[PDB]
């Protein structure tokens, strides 16, 4: 009968990619994020928007300051040494898989930094562009980031899927497999 | 290689037993290094690495700033909790339990992550030979897990969304 | 439509 929870406001600005990101986390899940370019709040579940509001330009303003701060930290640090923490990738199905019964594949990229990856879905060794979903860079307990990639599919014994993730810390693109 | 530069900041609101005990932990990062901290339990900024010392000294000299921050335990943290207590905190999603051949207990599509799964063979909890995948977060506010028993037979699932325990049994 | 509160970023400098 003890309600124990955590709310995180996570925001960053990245170079040389010149992009920033702003989001709220509740007990390990995304509540929302703000599209900095488009300036709109994006609720993780559509149903959330019926209960809460977030003024979008608030997030824009912060990122601007975070942008500026980045310059200050750069000039401050004598040597900025490039270092990478390589991701660990996991593929699995959202639900128990039944043949002919629509489902979702989840590509769980975890424990990595910087927040930049190339992720590719592969049906039978060929890239897939239809039915793919992505999540902003999510926060952790540590300094590392977390990410989800989703793929909708119809199960059959003929198809096999792969999720291929590339990150500046990997020697070779990591490819994680899944079949029936 | 490829040089990169990150200015990362996480403001954590910690709730132990609702809004009774609450602490704020603001953490500033530079690339891979946590450099600055604001711990509401300390009430001042503290440098984690030398890189954060200037910010710490700068901001700690601002009383009205620190005064505002310590108050953010109420003005921001508890403020938001009041809102989230209406839909996020009480959010309940009933699990879907499935059994298939080692015997697998597939508990899928549930929220929150508070879940207990036991294996009963002939009515006693087989507290040995249990292989679990652990809790798995789908990232869409739904969880899943596989609890397995290595014997050559019914599993029970208890959850906050269930008034009465869920049971499944195999022939 | 209750409006969530947030932390405001402070410029670093001197």
């Amino acid at each position, epitope marked *: 009968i003890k309600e124990e929870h955590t709310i995180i406001q996570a925001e960053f600005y990245l170079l040389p990619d010149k992009r920033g990101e702003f989001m709220f986390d509740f007990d390990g899940d995304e509540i929302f994020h703000v599209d900095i370019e488009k300036s709109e709040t994006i609720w993780r579940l559509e149903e959330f928007a019926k209960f809460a509001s977030f003024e979008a330009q*608030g997030a824009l303003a912060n990122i601007a300051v975070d942008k500026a701060n980045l310059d200050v930290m750069k000039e401050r640090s004598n040597n900025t040494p490039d270092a990478n923490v390589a991701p660990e990738v996991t593929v699995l199905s959202r639900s128990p898989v039944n043949l002919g019964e629509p489902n979702i594949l989840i590509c769980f990229i975890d424990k990595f930094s910087p927040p930049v990856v190339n992720v590719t879905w592969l049906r039978n060794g060929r890239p897939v562009t239809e039915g793919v979903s992505e999540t902003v860079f999510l926060p952790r307990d540590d300094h590392l980031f977390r990410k989800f990639h989703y793929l909708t599919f119809l199960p059959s014994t003929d198809d096999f899927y792969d999720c291929e993730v590339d990150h500046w810390g990997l020697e070779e693109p990591l490819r994680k497999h899944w079949e029936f | 290689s490829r040089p990169w530069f990150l200015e990362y900041c996480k403001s954590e609101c910690h709730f132990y037993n609702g809004t009774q005990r609450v602490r704020l932990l603001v953490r500033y990062f530079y690339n891979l290094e946590e450099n600055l901290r604001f711990d509401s339990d300390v009430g001042e900024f503290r440098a984690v690495t030398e890189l954060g010392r200037p910010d710490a000294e700068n901001w700690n000299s601002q009383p*009205e700033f620190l*005064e505002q921050k310590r108050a*953010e335990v109420d*003005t921001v943290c*508890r403020h938001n909790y009041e809102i989230f207590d209406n839909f996020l905190v009480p959010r309940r999603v009933e699990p879907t339990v499935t059994v298939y051949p080692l015997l697998v207990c597939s508990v899928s599509d549930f929220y929150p992550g508070n879940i207990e799964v036991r294996w009963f063979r002939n009515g006693k909890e087989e507290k040995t030979g249990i292989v679990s995948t652990g809790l798995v977060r789908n990232g869409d506010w739904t969880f899943q897990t596989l609890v397995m028993l290595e014997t050559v037979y019914t599993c029970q699932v208890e959850h906050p969304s269930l008034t009465d325990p869920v049971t499944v049994e195999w022939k | 439509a209750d409006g969530l*509160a947030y932390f*405001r970023s*402070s410029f670093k*400098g001197g």
Partner: T-cell receptor
Amino acid sequence: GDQVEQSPSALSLHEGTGSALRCNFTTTMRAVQWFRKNSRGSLINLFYLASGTKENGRLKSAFDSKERYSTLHIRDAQLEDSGTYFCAAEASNTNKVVFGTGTRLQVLP
Amino acid sequence: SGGKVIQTPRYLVKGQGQKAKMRCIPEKGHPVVFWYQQNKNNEFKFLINFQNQEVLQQIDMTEKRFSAECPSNSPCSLEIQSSEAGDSALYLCASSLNNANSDYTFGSGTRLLVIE
């Protein structure tokens, strides 16, 4: 119309009496500020409150973040206390400072 | 200087269509500057704010009708390009230290009157 409810509008105090001003907020404020504008004088900064109370000479200020109000108390009213009193606070859910409607205080000798 | 904000001139009268430039010296060491326009009903109208030389925010009117800059080691300025009767008001300058704060400290303000 988009300001803070500040009461009373106007106030007359006999020299040596006291009264209180009060701002009512429509949401959680991050902190409150109080000003006095003299006679042909500048805006004088009186208090900055983020929480609790602060007392400065004959002035005491209080801010309750939850109950969404702030009060300014004048005791032992003096001639120089005459003027217009403003409150100003910014919401925790926005970026913008909003002001009170103002209180004109006249102190009778 | 400080802790004081110096606004000049105390008063200013201009003819309709003339320019009205007013100046403000923020507190020593204060990077944050705001311009407010107060009317007869004690309402505070936001015009524009600066962080040093950079403009963080301003309204449509200040963008189209006003020109303001806060030059390094120089008095901040707000100038009306073509004054009209509607611009008669008290213009307030307030300086802060930390952009994520209140604790404004206001100047004496410039009283502007525009006449035909």
